[PDB]
């Protein structure tokens, strides 16, 4: 499972849109049910959901609206197949207070 999130930093009160590719060991689309849960840095899962990749070509677009009163830091998204819950795939997105910088600095 290859989690893809559109951005890499979200302000509170903003919507996160992410995708969950589902591929088998040859890197081909496969139809299997997934489990995804979004856990704040205290490791306490917040949203639990179940999907199926059948008739979807192995691309599952999803969403979540970050609650207004949340804790900053590295949030995590954990996804795993239903059959083998021992293997967990993850991707971290950061919730922070920010306004977009106007320029890039390279050292």
């Amino acid at each position: 499972l290859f989690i893809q999130t559109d951005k890499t930093i979200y302000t509170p009160g903003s919507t996160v849109l992410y995708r969950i590719f589902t591929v088998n060991h040859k890197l081909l689309p496969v139809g299997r049910t997934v489990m995804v849960n979004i856990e704040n840095p205290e490791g306490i899962p917040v949203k639990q959901d179940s999907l199926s990749s059948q008739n979807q070509l192995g691309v599952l677009p999803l969403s979540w609206d970050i609650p207004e009163l949340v804790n900053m830091g590295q949030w995590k998204i954990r996804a795993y197949y239903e059959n083998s819950p021992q293997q967990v795939f993850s991707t971290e997105f950061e919730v922070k207070e920010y306004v977009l910088p106007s320029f890039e600095v390279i050292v």
Binding site: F2, I9, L27
Partner: protein, 107 residues
């Protein structure tokens, strides 16, 4: 490099630089029957946090680290060579490789 071939470029050859509110044409060169998923993201967010980005190198690294082999070639003897490759070879006479009972390769 990936099994297929995907690339994105601009329909307008050179022209002048775009303008906020001006349309643009994207040309996508992918294999027939494929389904592409698009996301357009500002560069300020990558200025703030450039971690957890998706790229082909990461996918190939993840696929490679989940191999069955253990050493890039040769071994103590035939049983060692086959086990290092990640196979089993059993004959009616009796020449068979050593048993494996651990998922992760030793050290």
């Amino acid at each position: 490099s990936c099994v297929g071939s995907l690339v994105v470029k601009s329909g307008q050859s050179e022209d002048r630089q775009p303008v906020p509110g001006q349309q643009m044409t994207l040309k996508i060169e992918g294999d027939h029957g494929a389904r592409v998923v698009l996301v357009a993201v500002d560069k300020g967010v990558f200025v703030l946090n450039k971690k957890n980005k998706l790229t082909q190198s990461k996918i190939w690294d993840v696929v490679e680290k989940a191999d069955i082999g253990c050493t890039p070639g040769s071994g103590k003897d035939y049983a060692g060579v086959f086990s290092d490759a990640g196979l089993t070879f059993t004959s009616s006479s009796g020449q068979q490789t050593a048993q494996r009972a651990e998922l992760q390769c030793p050290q």
